[PDB]
Design a protein around this ligand. Structure first.
Ligand SMILES: [Mg+2]
Ligand SMILES: [Mg+2]
Ligand SMILES: [Mg+2]
Ligand SMILES: [Mg+2]
Ligand SMILES: [Mg+2]
Ligand SMILES: [Mg+2]
Ligand SMILES: [Mg+2]
Ligand SMILES: [Mg+2]
Ligand SMILES: [Mg+2]
Ligand SMILES: [Mg+2]
Ligand SMILES: [Mg+2]
Ligand SMILES: [Mg+2]
Ligand SMILES: [Mg+2]
Ligand SMILES: [Mg+2]
Ligand SMILES: [Mg+2]
Ligand SMILES: [Mg+2]
Ligand SMILES: [Mg+2]
Ligand SMILES: [Mg+2]
Ligand SMILES: [Mg+2]
Ligand code: NA
Ligand code: NA
Ligand code: NA
Ligand code: NA
Ligand code: NA
Ligand code: NA
Lengths: 54, 117, 258, 152
RNA sequence: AACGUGUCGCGAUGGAUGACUUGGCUUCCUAUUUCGUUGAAGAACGCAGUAAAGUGCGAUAAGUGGUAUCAAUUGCAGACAUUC
RNA sequence: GUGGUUGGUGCAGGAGUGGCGAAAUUCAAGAAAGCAAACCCGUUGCUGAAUACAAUCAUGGAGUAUUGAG
RNA sequence: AAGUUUGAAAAGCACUUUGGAAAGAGAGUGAAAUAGAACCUGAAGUCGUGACAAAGACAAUGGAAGUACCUCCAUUUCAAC
RNA sequence: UGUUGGCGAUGGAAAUGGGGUGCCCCCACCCGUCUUGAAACACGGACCAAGGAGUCAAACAGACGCGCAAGGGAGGAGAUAUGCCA
RNA sequence: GAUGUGGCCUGGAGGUUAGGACGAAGCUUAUGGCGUGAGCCUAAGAUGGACCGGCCUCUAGUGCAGAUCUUGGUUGGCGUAGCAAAGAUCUAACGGAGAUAUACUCAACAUGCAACGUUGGAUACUGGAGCGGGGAAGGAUUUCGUGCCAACGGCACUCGUA
């Protein structure tokens, strides 16, 4: 019995969820710390290579 | 490996030249003092003595290192069958103890390589 | 995403005297005409298959994290709370235990163990050693084969001098510049046993600030003010000022009637 | 490999066994249950006379809608039969037990059957064909038999 | 009486549970990383002293050459170690 | 004066890759089990000598365990 | 569909004897055969067998309260309560 | 709140509670379902094992727990402990 | 229909406290004790042979009697319904473990039945649009000899397209 709620506009009516029939359309961030580590390592190597230039 | 699955798979699918190293035995106090080496891979025609099991205390010469059943065979270690014929019993190399080495040129090279001094 | 659903099953309808569930198509095998596509069917699909966009991680307010670290540090200086958590501190000289800074020059584990025996942390180290065993349950199939208790933690001012202590089983090493709540309160229980080096002990005030002066590291952070000035309420309850106003004490089968 | 019961004195007894007979279990049950307390020579005579068809085996548990006969009055029933395939196998079992007793050195003329037990074995499978393209089972039901006899 | 009923001890038929796990699923990373007319992917037929499937190989056919290693391989047979 | 990104001739190091390469008990006991109440006394005291057992008679794995030293 | 998951090791049951054979009865290996070849454990349901209790002219099952017989169960007492 | 007997002298005992099976007197329609109404001549129902159904994400609200408060809090990214450490 | 419970139970994680070859988990019960209950605990195993309990937090693919529920096993009906088109076999001698198989008395019958192959003889059937002799499509070793008889040839076999 919908009481006094807001009127929802959740916007999820396309095939975004991957299931047995759909590939999906999603993006997760589970590689965030690994990629951050990789970026820092690359920057340190590049500084070492181009030394003494800034 | 820090994975039990990977470690056990490597052990049980090891090739022959890896099983040779995996099947090693310690040396006596006399040989340890003489060569400064703690253990060597077992080889045919070595002299060993059994330190564990129901054949503990027996000494003999090695006649085979099967390497497919992970055992060595010793001539004095045997039992009887139903029909009265004799068969050999396999021991694991880490349960025995080398007391005399079959020495060759390459074997002495290996011992010099592994000398800890 | 495709598991349990890799068949071309269809329902047979009614009229045939079988329940209306999708059934595998074809003939010639034992799987022909068997139920498919359902949590109730063998070989079927599970109810609500699990996804990788479940919320695995959590957000915590920075101030609440700092509050928790401060509270665990304060609890690690009351010798009864350490005992309740479970450490063996019966023959320990003092709590907090502060030790000279010359242990950072050790180079052999024999020297490290001699120092531990002199300080009398060896009782807790032995507790940890004797507790080691093989875990119960399925966990030992999943790279979690051994379990043991938690021993003392030794805090150093930097990352130098740990070579002698690194291999001792049952001793943990910490850096004062980055203290971890998961180590200061294992299991969620406060009262870890901590051995302080003198330099780290003198760095504590600059790292955490005081009740009036702010921290030089955690920008604009001061220790939280207490809700009670004196936490002993039984003394207040029994004091003379309260007893003068307490209310005075007072002094304290047939039924028929005919 | 032990039996469900043991003899009182094990030096004056003999044993025999069959595992998967390939005789009908329901027929061998009746054929073997009738000799439970009899002397060995009496049991052998009864089996010979059943083969000659002058006596019968009483059917007591598995007798649903079988015929009535006048040779069943001896056992207090009205229904009995003459199963030759089971009779000729119980004869072999008795011969084996007698040989065992003779080897142990006992007198076969003094032995009395004391234990008989018949049980169902695993079942083999064939098939039959019915109307409208149906296929339906056609199974074989074999038996285990065990017995021992003691000297009187 | 017989048949049937009920309880207990022993035995069958059956293949659950527990313990085990060289398997699956999921998530990350590294790089001198991307097939074919110089005939690929796929498909067929063969090859061992003994050899059906599988694995490996191609009339040089359970493999030839080179390096390294060092004494086996094994169901049964058969036959340079300073490394043929 | 410069160019190893014009071509031809030579010969160096490093990285990467593959091989080799470390310590310390098969230590002692065949009840090989306990107790002495947070710590210490205790590197010390005192507890059996066993045979039980099995609905007259016979029968009964491997020490990575225990305990103490190192 | 389908774990070859016997056992530490094949030590995988020589020999006697009954049977056409499959097998049975002994003997033996092994800590165990109640570990005998697809052989760890070995449930429920169903069946055989021995002993026992009664009674099927109120379908059985069920409740409440007694009694007869049994009880590899527990607790208490034994010369002072 | 005392008093008088019986049984019980260390047993294969006595006693008191449980448990099992039979018997007597009394009581007592077959479960689940939909329905105003089921013991129904209303549907499902031979036995056992293992499996089998309110879950994950996202927007909003109310109640309750915690931190700070005219302020509260990120996110993405960086820096160095750090090169076991997602 | 709502709510509460220092309310019960299952797989895993962080802590803490413990157990096990002088026997862990699992399994069995006329094994009692405790709890209003969900349940917990002890006993015995003449069962088993290597792991695992309590408490405080955290977490989820977390509790079954029924869905013409899904998979595997079992079961009464039941030694029952049936195994009735295509006419049909008999006899002797060989072969075979398939017999002429006894506690004795006893000549023998009334206490070893039933069924099998080859050869000879007898009696029938097919009846030239044939249970004759050759081929295509389809099949692919079913062909032949020697053995064997566990399963298969809906009865049987000493025989077989096995
Ligand atoms: Mg409404
Ligand atoms: Mg309303
Ligand atoms: Mg699909
Ligand atoms: Mg280390
Ligand atoms: Mg009839
Ligand atoms: Mg038909
Ligand atoms: Mg048809
Ligand atoms: Mg009667
Ligand atoms: Mg078994
Ligand atoms: Mg789970
Ligand atoms: Mg019962
Ligand atoms: Mg579920
Ligand atoms: Mg009939
Ligand atoms: Mg007929
Ligand atoms: Mg008909
Ligand atoms: Mg004619
Ligand atoms: Mg005509
Ligand atoms: Mg047939
Ligand atoms: Mg032939
Ligand atoms: Na599945
Ligand atoms: Na020793
Ligand atoms: Na409903
Ligand atoms: Na109803
Ligand atoms: Na169930
Ligand atoms: Na006919």
């Amino acid at each position: 019995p919908k009481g006094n709620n807001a009127i929802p506009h959740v916007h999820q009516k396309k095939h975004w969820n991957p299931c047995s029939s759909q590939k999906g359309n999603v993006k997760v961030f589970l590689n965030q710390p690994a990629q951050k580590h990789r970026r820092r390592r690359l920057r340190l190597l590049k500084a070492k290579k181009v030394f003494p230039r800034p | 490996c820090g994975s039990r699955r990977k470690a056990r798979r490597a052990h049980f699918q090891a090739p022959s030249h890896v099983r040779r190293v995996l099947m090693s035995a310690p040396l006596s106090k006399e040989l340890r003092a003489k060569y400064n080496v703690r253990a060597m891979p077992v080889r045919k025609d070595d002299e060993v003595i059994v330190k564990r099991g129901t054949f503990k205390g027996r000494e003999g010469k090695v006649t085979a290192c099967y390497r497919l059943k992970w055992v060595i065979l010793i001539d004095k270690v045997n039992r009887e069958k139903a029909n009265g014929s004799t068969v050999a019993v396999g021991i694991h190399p880490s349960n025995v103890e080398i007391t005399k080495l079959k020495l060759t040129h390459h074997r002495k090279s290996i011992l010099e390589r592994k000398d800890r001094s | 995403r495709l598991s349990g659903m890799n068949h071309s099953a269809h329902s047979w309808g009614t009229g045939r005297a079988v329940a209306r569930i999708p059934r595998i198509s074809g003939g010639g095998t034992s799987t022909s005409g068997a139920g498919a596509f359902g949590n109730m069917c063998r070989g079927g699909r599970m109810f609500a298959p699990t996804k990788i966009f479940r919320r695995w991680h959590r957000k915590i307010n920075l101030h609440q994290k700092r509050f928790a670290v401060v509270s665990a540090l304060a609890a690690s200086s009351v010798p009864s709370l350490v005992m309740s958590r479970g450490h063996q501190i019966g023959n320990v000289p003092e709590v907090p235990l502060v030790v000279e800074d010359s242990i950072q020059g050790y180079e052999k584990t024999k020297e490290a163990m001699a120092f531990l025996k002199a300080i009398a942390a060896i009782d807790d180290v032995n507790r940890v050693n004797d507790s080691r065993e093989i875990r119960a349950g399925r966990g030992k199939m999943r790279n979690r084969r051994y379990v043991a208790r938690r021993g003392p933690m030794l805090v150093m001012p930097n990352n130098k001098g740990t070579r002698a202590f690194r291999n001792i089983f049952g001793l943990d090493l910490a850096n004062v510049s980055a203290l971890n709540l998961l180590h200061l309160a294992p299991g969620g229980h406060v009262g870890r046993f901590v051995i302080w080096t003198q330099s780290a002990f003198e760095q504590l005030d600059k790292i955490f600030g005081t009740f009036t002066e702010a921290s030089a590291v955690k920008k604009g952070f001061t220790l939280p003010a207490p809700m009670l000035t004196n936490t002993d309420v039984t003394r207040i309850m029994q004091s003379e000022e309260v007893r003068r106003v307490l209310k005075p004490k007072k002094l304290q089968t047939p039924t028929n009637g005919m | 490999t032990h039996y469900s019961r043991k003899p009182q004195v094990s030096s004056k007894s003999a044993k025999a066994k069959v595992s998967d007979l390939r005789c009908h279990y329901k027929n061998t049950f009746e054929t073997a249950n009738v000799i439970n307390g009899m002397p060995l020579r009496k049991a052998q005579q009864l089996y010979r006379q059943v083969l000659a068809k002058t006596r019968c085996i009483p059917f007591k548990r598995y007798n649903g809608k079988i015929g009535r006969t006048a040779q069943a009055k001896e056992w207090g029933q009205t229904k009995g039969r003459w199963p030759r395939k089971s009779v000729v196998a119980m004869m072999s079992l008795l011969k084996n037990a007698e040989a065992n007793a003779i080897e142990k050195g006992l007198d076969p003329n003094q032995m009395v059957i004391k234990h008989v037990q018949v049980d169902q074995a695993a079942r083999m499978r064939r098939r039959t064909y019915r109307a409208h393209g149906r296929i339906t089972p056609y199974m074989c039901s074999p038996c285990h038999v065990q017995l021992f006899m003691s000297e009187k």
